[PDB]
Amino acid sequence: KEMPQPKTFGELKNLPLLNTDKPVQALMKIADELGEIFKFEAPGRVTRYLSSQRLIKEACDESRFDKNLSQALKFVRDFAGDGLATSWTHEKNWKKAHNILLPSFSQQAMKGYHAMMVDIAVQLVQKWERLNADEHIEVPEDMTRLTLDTIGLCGFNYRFNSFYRDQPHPFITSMVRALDEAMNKLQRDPAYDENKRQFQEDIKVMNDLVDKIIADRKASGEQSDDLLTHMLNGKDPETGEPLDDENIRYQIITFLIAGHETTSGLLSFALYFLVKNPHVLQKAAEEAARVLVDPVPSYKQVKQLKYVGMVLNEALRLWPTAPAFSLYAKEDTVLGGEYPLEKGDELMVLIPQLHRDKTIWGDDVEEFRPERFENPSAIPQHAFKPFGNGQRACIGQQFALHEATLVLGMMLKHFDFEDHTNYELDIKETLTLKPEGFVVKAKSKKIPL
Amino acid sequence: KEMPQPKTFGELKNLPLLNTDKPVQALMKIADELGEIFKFEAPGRVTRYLSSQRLIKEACDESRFDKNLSQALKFVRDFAGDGLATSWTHEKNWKKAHNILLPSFSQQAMKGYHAMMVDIAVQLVQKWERLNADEHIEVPEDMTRLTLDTIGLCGFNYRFNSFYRDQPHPFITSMVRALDEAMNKLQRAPDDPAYDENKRQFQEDIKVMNDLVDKIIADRKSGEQSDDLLTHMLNGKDPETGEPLDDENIRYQIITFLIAGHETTSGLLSFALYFLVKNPHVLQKAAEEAARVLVDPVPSYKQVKQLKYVGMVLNEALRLWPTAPAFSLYAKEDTVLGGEYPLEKGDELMVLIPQLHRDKTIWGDDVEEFRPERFENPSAIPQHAFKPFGNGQRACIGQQFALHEATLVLGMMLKHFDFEDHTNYELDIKETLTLKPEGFVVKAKSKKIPL
Ligand code: HEM
Ligand code: HEM
Ligand SMILES: O=C(CCCCCn1ccnc1)N[C@@H](Cc1ccccc1)C(=O)O
Numbered sequence A: 001k002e003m004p005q006p007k008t009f010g011e012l013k014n015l016p017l018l019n020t021d022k023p024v025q026a027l028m029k030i031a032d033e034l035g036e037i038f039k040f041e042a043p044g045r046v047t048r049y050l051s052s053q054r055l056i057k058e059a060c061d062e063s064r065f066d067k068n069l070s071q072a073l074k075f076v077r078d079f080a081g082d083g084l085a086t087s088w089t090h091e092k093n094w095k096k097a098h099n100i101l102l103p104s105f106s107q108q109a110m111k112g113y114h115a116m117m118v119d120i121a122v123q124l125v126q127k128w129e130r131l132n133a134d135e136h137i138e139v140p141e142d143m144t145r146l147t148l149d150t151i152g153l154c155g156f157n158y159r160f161n162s163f164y165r166d167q168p169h170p171f172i173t174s175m176v177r178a179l180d181e182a183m184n185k186l187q188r189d190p191a192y193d194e195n196k197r198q199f200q201e202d203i204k205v206m207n208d209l210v211d212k213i214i215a216d217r218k219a220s221g222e223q224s225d226d227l228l229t230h231m232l233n234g235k236d237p238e239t240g241e242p243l244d245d246e247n248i249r250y251q252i253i254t255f256l257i258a259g260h261e262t263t264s265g266l267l268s269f270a271l272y273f274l275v276k277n278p279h280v281l282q283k284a285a286e287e288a289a290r291v292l293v294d295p296v297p298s299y300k301q302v303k304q305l306k307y308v309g310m311v312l313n314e315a316l317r318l319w320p321t322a323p324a325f326s327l328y329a330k331e332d333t334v335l336g337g338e339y340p341l342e343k344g345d346e347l348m349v350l351i352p353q354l355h356r357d358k359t360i361w362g363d364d365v366e367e368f369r370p371e372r373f374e375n376p377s378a379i380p381q382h383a384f385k386p387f388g389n390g391q392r393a394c395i396g397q398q399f400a401l402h403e404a405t406l407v408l409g410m411m412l413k414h415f416d417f418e419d420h421t422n423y424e425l426d427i428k429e430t431l432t433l434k435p436e437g438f439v440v441k442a443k444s445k446k447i448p449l
Numbered sequence B: 001k002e003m004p005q006p007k008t009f010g011e012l013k014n015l016p017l018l019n020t021d022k023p024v025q026a027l028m029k030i031a032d033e034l035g036e037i038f039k040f041e042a043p044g045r046v047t048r049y050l051s052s053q054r055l056i057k058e059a060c061d062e063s064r065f066d067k068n069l070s071q072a073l074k075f076v077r078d079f080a081g082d083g084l085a086t087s088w089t090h091e092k093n094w095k096k097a098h099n100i101l102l103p104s105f106s107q108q109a110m111k112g113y114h115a116m117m118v119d120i121a122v123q124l125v126q127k128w129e130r131l132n133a134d135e136h137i138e139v140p141e142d143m144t145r146l147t148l149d150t151i152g153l154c155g156f157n158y159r160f161n162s163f164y165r166d167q168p169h170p171f172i173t174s175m176v177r178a179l180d181e182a183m184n185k186l187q188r189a190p191d192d193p194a195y196d197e198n199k200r201q202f203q204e205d206i207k208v209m210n211d212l213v214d215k216i217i218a219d220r221k222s223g224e225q226s227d228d229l230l231t232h233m234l235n236g237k238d239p240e241t242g243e244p245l246d247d248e249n250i251r252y253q254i255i256t257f258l259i260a261g262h263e264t265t266s267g268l269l270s271f272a273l274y275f276l277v278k279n280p281h282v283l284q285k286a287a288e289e290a291a292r293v294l295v296d297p298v299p300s301y302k303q304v305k306q307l308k309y310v311g312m313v314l315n316e317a318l319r320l321w322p323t324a325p326a327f328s329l330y331a332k333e334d335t336v337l338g339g340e341y342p343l344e345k346g347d348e349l350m351v352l353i354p355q356l357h358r359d360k361t362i363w364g365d366d367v368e369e370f371r372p373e374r375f376e377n378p379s380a381i382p383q384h385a386f387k388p389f390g391n392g393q394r395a396c397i398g399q400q401f402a403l404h405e406a407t408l409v410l411g412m413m414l415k416h417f418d419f420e421d422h423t424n425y426e427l428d429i430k431e432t433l434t435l436k437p438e439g440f441v442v443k444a445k446s447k448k449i450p451l
């Protein structure tokens, strides 16, 4: 009982606290002051921000709590539709799409995506080895080029060709602008018709590209090793039905958003933490050299990169790029023996604060020590949740980690890195997290592909 | 490519080399002569002893190598059964017991074990503060008293009362004698008529162990709930299969924890105190930390976590003389070790842990010096260079238990006493299945700080 609450803004309750360009970080500073739980009030909504493993492992009880759509996820739904990430658990299309798409995302399904992932990974390596002396690397921009191109090629055999462009592909231009307007609608129509006309024009740009690609593949009949094939041929064992063409569009849009932007933040945060801790970079570089013995990494070689994975896990601990998820109480219940919640009450899991629970991780929560994950079974349950919870956890988790391990093992194998600007960490907030302005210099090790 | 091999004894191959009372140390002298790898042959067995970080970091690749039961562990299994340490990874009872028992061994579970550990640690401090002038401390004997009573109290709320005894508890008499007979079966022959007294004694030794443990399980199964491992085993259920441990396996786990607890963890404290009195500057720094941290009459769980240098002291003692000195591995498929030693599926490897921890390419030239400052940054240490607790999912489950018990007890010892190596003790390491500094004695001068 007696739940804390931050300062109010008259009739707006706590909403202006999110009237800032780093609201997740602002919410972490509140959680540092107010503790394990605090109520957030806005006009028309009330939520509770959870920050401790003690409270979150109860919220992760799927028998008592189910996934809720946050205001951010509801606004994305205006173009992501009933895709996996923006649908309710009880909606017929979630379980339908979920069952069709799990065999395509398994760890054994990555053996087929591997060849296409190396296609994009080589493009990144070759861009950096074609730089001139004293030229630097814009890390998140090149990381976004690789993650967006990877899900496009593996998901529906489409080449955005991001490494041939300065300005992004027109699809990604509108997608980011739709995510931009969705995020701005949170802390927000007197003078918004321009904003809305731009919003609907960006949705039509996205829908047209995907709908032609689905129409092209069906008419051509060509079969590939991409998700688009599994969706046209896959049939849900429960209902016996396949996904209709509209849902397929929403899933591809979902994979393009939910894929690239969170997965490039992981690589950007990983490389940042590697150049800020030279001892960790050396251990990771030693493994990349010993394991990746061929000019072209194999699926089995990527799985042997244990320390690269621990580097990735510890980067996901300090700065998880999909930083929060929402839950609602399925019935009346009591949280932590002290916080009564009524049916339908909402919870928010502040993932970066969970990953700083000192009673779980010790006192050095802010230090980058990948050795925490040396034994993955030792970590308590529901203490480390960068990929959500339960059946509503990330379906592309094995995808994102295999790509990030392959690319990081390749960057560490082929290049020496220099934090030539002594970069000060500046985290940009969209729907995800990215280290803005992060640049490095790469000194090629002259190992051919 | 061609693997070295030590001297042979005709039809016995290399086995008479282990017909010695310090076989791990003898194996270290071979590794100094033959280098990073050498073949050890015995009648019916062949293994390869790895000693360098370069080859061991590959042997720790669990996708290529899994834990093997060494000839020692096969003999221990005759009473440890399919307990955690003597069962194969593919055996159903390992994964089951592994999932049920992991939450009771976490760093967060030690907050509940802490009070009971302090119970035993205070008994040790008060024994030493009740000695008379010119009386000394038999160090490994008193450290074993503490580790055995700690695992008995925290594991199943049973008091061996080792600080009330001259002769050891009747349980360990067979327990310790069974390990001795198990170790002797190695450098022995197979079963002949002559070794019958050994065999009748062996089965009577197991019956002592099984009867004591099974009564404790039957006694508890009162309905009383405790904060001990036994409670978690009777009520815990594996999330995978949904099944709990049966009563046969449960005694095997208690027997395992009783073995795997006291003797390995008391050698660590014994070796720690040895290296501290042999390096007065390190002892002083560690004693200063104990003083500026342990400000209460009873150390807290958070205070033990703040004993950074004591932890570095313990790790450095585990580097020079790890008390579980070796473990066994087998190749899951045909593979090549270090690009020059092809291994077939099922071939065995041995990690000589004390030789690994002397790899000059990792630790420099002062490998033999006791410098706890090596462990100031765990990320600086190369991968798989430091393996006192095994490897992977088959690593030591009681790592946080043993280190919390040793850090609390060592921090309390450094706070309350000044120590004097009054005999200029010459290190004589006795070998059983573990390592202990035999005959190690010190004098303790109370600092007169009350509890
Ligand atoms: C490291 C990068 C990524 C992170 C941190 C991440 C994180 C998450 C999280 C936390 C959720 C659950 C959100 C919720 O509670 O509602 C989620 C859902 C999802 N993610 Fe990811 N994700 C990543 C990359 C990807 C990729 C590459 C894909 C595939 C293209 C993907 C596909 C999905 C899908 C389909 C869902 C919805 C699952 C469902 O509705 O049941 N994610 N992700
Ligand atoms: C510093 C003291 C200790 C050392 C040096 C040590 C050493 C080891 C080693 C090397 C292993 C792996 C053996 C293998 O490769 O198969 C191991 C496993 C094990 N240890 Fe310890 N240990 C210590 C303390 C403890 C304590 C206090 C307990 C609990 C009473 C314990 C319980 C176990 C168990 C249950 C296993 C088996 C783990 C498994 O099978 O997955 N150990 N120990
Ligand atoms: O972060 C979220 C929603 C998280 C969406 C992540 C996007 N995703 C989901 C699955 N894969 C990617 N919700 C909070 C915090 C916040 C407020 C304003 C601006 C940014 C973040 C809120 O609604 O208040």
Ligand SMILES: O=C(CCCCCn1ccnc1)N[C@@H](Cc1ccccc1)C(=O)O
Pocket: B018, B023, B024, B070, B071, B072, B073, B085, B186, B260, B264, B324, B325, B326, B327, B350, B432, B433, B434
């Ligand atoms: O003994 C062993 C392994 C014994 C390790 C300690 C047992 N343990 C491990 C964890 N908790 C207890 N490995 C070799 C070398 C050797 C031979 C004879 C005598 C001593 C050592 C072998 O068996 O041949």
